[PDB]
Amino acid sequence: ERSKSLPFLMKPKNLDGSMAGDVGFDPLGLSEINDVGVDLYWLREAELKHCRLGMMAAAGILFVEILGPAPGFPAGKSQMDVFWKVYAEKPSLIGASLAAIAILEVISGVATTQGRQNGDRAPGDYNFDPLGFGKDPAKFKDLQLKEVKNGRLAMIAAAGMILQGVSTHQGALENLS
């Protein structure tokens, strides 16, 4: 009856055990929202998209700062400020990436709403397993848990890197030391 994460709180009604990373940590009861097209399905899809985006962004920042930029690309070690140097010399790359992300996000929203309507697609599912790393069950649950935990950690990390780069105008590991 009590949430596993917060023993002083009752179990959130909509979070039983199903989703990976579920420990009952919903103090504000946001999982019970059923308005403005927002429900547990939409919240989970948003959480998974945030997890994946944060993982990609943190990996990119760390890669560029440690191993350096790719040939022909600007340096500076400040990832929040090197973006304007890339846009100053290769605006077409940024524009094409933005257009591609826009199209993919329109497709993602359509897929989310459709899967919410005629329930056949789990939240965050895009059938993207080209290498077959999660075919069999009893490993899919473990992979989902790993992805969720890594994505939450990378969300926090990427938000921290964004704020550090905006404020200190220095590199992430530069702030570290």
Ligand X SMILES: C/C(C=C=C1C(C)(C)C[C@H](O)C[C@@]1(C)O)=C/C=C/C(C)=C/C=C/C=C(C)/C=C/C=C(/C=C/[C@@]12O[C@]1(C)C[C@@H](O)CC2(C)C)CO
* Footprint of ligand XAT (CB under 6 A): 91-92, 94-96, 99
- Neighbouring residues of 176: CB distance < 8 A, sequence distance ≥ 6: none
Looking at this protein, which amino acid is placed at residue 57?
A
Residue 131 contact partner, candidates ligand X, another protein, ligand XAT, none, CB within 5 to 8 A by sort of partner = none
Count of residues that interact with ligand CLA, criterion CB under 6 A: 39
CA–CA dist 147, 56 (Å, integer): 12
What token pair was written down for 36?
């403005």
> What is the spatial distance between Cα 175 and Cα 160, in angstroms, rounded to a whole number?
11
SS3 state at 38: strand
Which residue number, 29 or 68, has a Cβ lying nearer to another protein? Answer: 29
Residue 135's contacts (CB-CB under 8 Å, 6 or more residues apart) are 129
Report the residue number, 6 or 159, with the smaller CB distance to ligand X: 159
If one asks whether residue 37 binds another protein (CB under 8 A), the answer comes out as: no
Q: Does 40 bind ligand X (CB under 6 A)?
A: no
59 binds ligand X per the rule CB under 6 A: no
Contact positions with ligand CLA (CB under 6 A) in 112-151: 112
Q: Could you tell me the smallest distance in angstroms from the CB atom of residue 130 to ligand XAT?
A: 16
